[PDB]
Write an enzyme that holds these catalytic residues in place. Structure first.
Site, short mmCIF file in Angstrom:
data_model
loop_
_atom_site.label_atom_id
_atom_site.label_comp_id
_atom_site.label_asym_id
_atom_site.label_seq_id
_atom_site.Cartn_x
_atom_site.Cartn_y
_atom_site.Cartn_z
N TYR A 30 25.82 56.28 15.16
CA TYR A 30 26.42 56.97 13.98
C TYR A 30 26.82 55.97 12.88
CZ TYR A 30 26.53 61.32 16.66
OH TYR A 30 26.16 62.44 17.34
N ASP A 159 26.49 64.19 6.79
CA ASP A 159 25.28 63.37 6.60
C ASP A 159 25.56 62.00 7.19
OD1 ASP A 159 22.83 62.35 5.93
OD2 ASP A 159 22.83 63.36 3.96
N1 LIG Z 1 30.15 60.35 14.72
C1 LIG Z 1 31.12 61.24 14.46
C2 LIG Z 1 32.01 61.30 13.39
C3 LIG Z 1 31.92 60.33 12.29
O1 LIG Z 1 31.02 59.49 12.27
N2 LIG Z 1 32.83 60.44 11.33
C4 LIG Z 1 32.81 59.60 10.15
C5 LIG Z 1 31.92 60.16 9.06
C6 LIG Z 1 31.01 61.17 9.32
C7 LIG Z 1 30.20 61.68 8.32
C8 LIG Z 1 30.28 61.18 7.03
C9 LIG Z 1 29.44 61.83 5.98
O2 LIG Z 1 28.97 62.95 6.17
N3 LIG Z 1 29.22 61.13 4.86
C10 LIG Z 1 28.35 61.62 3.80
C11 LIG Z 1 29.14 62.22 2.64
C12 LIG Z 1 29.60 63.64 2.84
C13 LIG Z 1 28.48 64.69 2.92
C14 LIG Z 1 28.01 65.12 1.53
C15 LIG Z 1 26.99 66.26 1.59
C16 LIG Z 1 27.53 67.44 2.37
C17 LIG Z 1 27.95 67.02 3.76
C18 LIG Z 1 28.97 65.89 3.70
C19 LIG Z 1 27.52 60.48 3.24
O3 LIG Z 1 27.74 60.03 2.12
N4 LIG Z 1 26.56 60.01 4.07
C20 LIG Z 1 25.64 58.98 3.78
C21 LIG Z 1 24.28 59.19 3.91
C22 LIG Z 1 23.38 58.18 3.62
C23 LIG Z 1 23.88 56.98 3.20
F1 LIG Z 1 23.00 55.96 2.97
C24 LIG Z 1 25.21 56.73 3.05
C25 LIG Z 1 26.11 57.75 3.34
C26 LIG Z 1 31.19 60.16 6.77
C27 LIG Z 1 31.99 59.65 7.77
C28 LIG Z 1 32.81 62.43 13.65
N5 LIG Z 1 32.46 63.05 14.77
N6 LIG Z 1 31.40 62.31 15.25
C29 LIG Z 1 30.73 62.76 16.43
C30 LIG Z 1 31.17 62.36 17.68
C31 LIG Z 1 30.48 62.76 18.81
C32 LIG Z 1 29.35 63.55 18.70
C33 LIG Z 1 28.91 63.95 17.45
C34 LIG Z 1 29.60 63.56 16.31
#
Ligand SMILES: Nc1c(C(=O)NCc2ccc(C(=O)N[C@@H](CCC3CCCCC3)C(=O)Nc3ccc(F)cc3)cc2)cnn1-c1ccccc1
EC number: 2.7.11.24
Length: 328
Positions: A30, A159
């Site tokens: 992740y 994402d």
């Molecule tokens: N592994 C985890 C977590 C985690 O990891 N929590 C931190 C976390 C997560 C997601 C984001 C995130 O979604 N960030 C998004 C912004 C927001 C979106 C915008 C559009 C709509 C949806 C939300 C983003 O900018 N991503 C990104 C993509 C490509 C890149 F090059 C750079 C960044 C940020 C931080 C929780 N739970 N789990 C988890 C645990 C066990 C099993 C399954 C999952």
């Protein structure tokens, strides 16, 4: 004002986090993400240490973008920001960003699903997409691994950054100009199909094979749609019959087949929106027009700017300092 941080090495990786967050345990796909205990809430959380956040203009803008997007998202079906912190006391010493979100139980890629569960899971995706789309944000990378559930089947869109192309709308399979929010609805159709059949609907080996597998289901475009394609390449490439979805998705809820037909439409101008899909009969058990909120406006003007690393870094720092924790 400022908390007490403690240092710790986890993957030959220095983590510097407030004492608030305890028992950090790496979740390593992740990113740099640890499951932590939040002593303030008594709930488990996820802490993400951004990798090399200001390595380059691209990373700097990506860092800023991720923090802007996370600070904006206030919806039950979209990942939200519980906390953002840096061990840095000044802009001068600012080189690490940590993001705190809810800890999710499993991705939808992990999870025979019942029609009830498909209804409730796709309802929650569309409710989240309605919200995201209302702020003129397009996900663009919806796939099962970017959707997370807890044991309660409560779903959040995120994402994390298998193949995206399997879930990608035909109109952005070649060029990324003539597309709207409904690219995400195509993705929802591919996911819902997979949830109903347990098979990837369109497992293309590349962007041309992908287009082949899509056209085999939805049929080659009519003259009506062929006339709206600018690219001689894409047009000349495409230049046969639409299948009966009821045959392909044999034994499904016929209302799931009908919604799938409105989602997997080649013509992006005629594809059902998130808002419209929510009002589809399939979701009669879960649809409430008074509990499907839209987002506050989102300032996306930064997307057009070409700025220096120190500019993106200073903007990110502002956004760290101005962060207001959500209520408990
Ligand atoms: N592994 C985890 C977590 C985690 O990891 N929590 C931190 C976390 C997560 C997601 C984001 C995130 O979604 N960030 C998004 C912004 C927001 C979106 C915008 C559009 C709509 C949806 C939300 C983003 O900018 N991503 C990104 C993509 C490509 C890149 F090059 C750079 C960044 C940020 C931080 C929780 N739970 N789990 C988890 C645990 C066990 C099993 C399954 C999952």
């Amino acid at each position: 004002e400022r908390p007490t941080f403690y240092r710790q090495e986890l993957n030959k990786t220095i983590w510097e986090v407030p004492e608030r967050y305890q028992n950090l345990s790496p979740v390593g796909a992740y990113g740099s993400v640890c499951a932590a205990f939040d002593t303030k809430t008594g709930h488990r959380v996820a802490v993400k240490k951004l990798s090399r956040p200001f390595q380059s203009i691209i990373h700097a803008k990506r860092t800023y973008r991720e923090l802007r997007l996370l600070k904006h998202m206030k919806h039950e079906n979209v990942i939200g920001l519980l906390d953002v912190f840096t061990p840095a006391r000044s802009l001068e010493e600012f080189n690490d960003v940590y993001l705190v979100t809810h800890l999710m139980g499993a991705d939808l890629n992990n999870i025979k699903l019942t029609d009830d569960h498909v209804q409730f899971l796709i309802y929650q995706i569309l409710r989240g997409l309605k919200y995201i789309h209302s702020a003129d944000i397009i996900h663009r990378d919806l796939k099962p691994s970017n959707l997370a559930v807890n044991e309660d089947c409560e779903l959040k869109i995120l994402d994390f950054g298998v193949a995206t192309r399997w879930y990608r709308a035909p109109e952005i399979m070649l060029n990324w100009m003539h597309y709207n929010q409904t690219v995400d609805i195509w993705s929802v159709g591919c996911i819902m199909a997979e949830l109903l059949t347990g098979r990837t609907l369109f497992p293309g080996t590349d962007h041309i094979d992908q287009l082949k597998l899509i056209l085999r289901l939805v049929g080659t475009p009519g003259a009506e749609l062929l006339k709206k394609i600018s690219s001689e390449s894409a047009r000349n490439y495409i230049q046969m019959p639409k299948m009966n979805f009821a045959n392909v998705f044999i034994g499904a809820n016929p209302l799931a087949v009908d919604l799938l037909e409105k989602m997997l439409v080649l013509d992006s101008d005629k594809r059902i929106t998130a808002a419209q899909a929510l009002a589809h009969a399939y979701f009669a058990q879960y649809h409430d027009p008074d509990d499907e909120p839209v987002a506050d406006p989102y300032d996306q003007s930064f997307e057009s700017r070409d700025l220096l690393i120190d500019e993106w870094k200073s903007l990110t720092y502002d956004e760290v300092i101005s962060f207001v924790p959500p209520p408990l």
